[PDB]
């Protein structure tokens with residue numbers, strides 16, 4: 632584990648992360664997809680061999696020795712707010728189990744269900760809070776990746792508030 636486990640946020644492409652493993656914001660069918668998923672496909676295409684997995688789950692596939700944890704958040708266009716909230720929390724709990732099993736000291740993670748799966752709603756606080764609930768009991772250094780300047784500021788504020 633990390634000597635003093637921390638949370639940090641960076642505004643940049645997660646495909647250029649400086650961590651020991653990455654979490655992909657995957658679709659259930661293991662397709663190249665869009666956004667983070669397409670960037671992950673271009674950087675680690677080998678990790679998409681048998682990566683299909685249901686909503687609310689995570690499935691790890693190596694690219695060489697580098698782990699890619701495919702986490703499938705719900706598409707809020709399809710689920711009700713109640714059911715989607717439950718599956719979003721579940722996807723993050725499965726990420727925590729995989730990070731622990733892998734024994735890594737750091738992990739790069741995006742905010743699940745905040746892009747094309749958001750159903751057109753701002754889900755920063757909802758997704759980030761489920762990320763904290765799952766990852767708080769792990770000892771890996773967590774680095775959250777985002778692309779928007781206002782989101783970077785809000786995530787950074789939420790991290791610092793708890794310290």
Ligand SMILES: O=C(N[C@H]1CCS(=O)(=O)C1)c1cccs1
Pocket residue numbers: 656657658663664665666667668669741742743744745746747748
């Ligand atoms: O790329 C994202 N979501 C993926 C869900 C499956 S997909 O439709 O292929 C795109 C992101 C999540 C957060 C920021 S971007």
Ligand SMILES: [Cl-]
Pocket residue numbers: 643644647
């Ligand atoms: Cl970048």
Ligand SMILES: [Cl-]
Pocket residue numbers: 656743744745746747748749
């Ligand atoms: Cl998304």
Ligand SMILES: [Cl-]
Pocket residue numbers: 777778779782
């Ligand atoms: Cl963002």
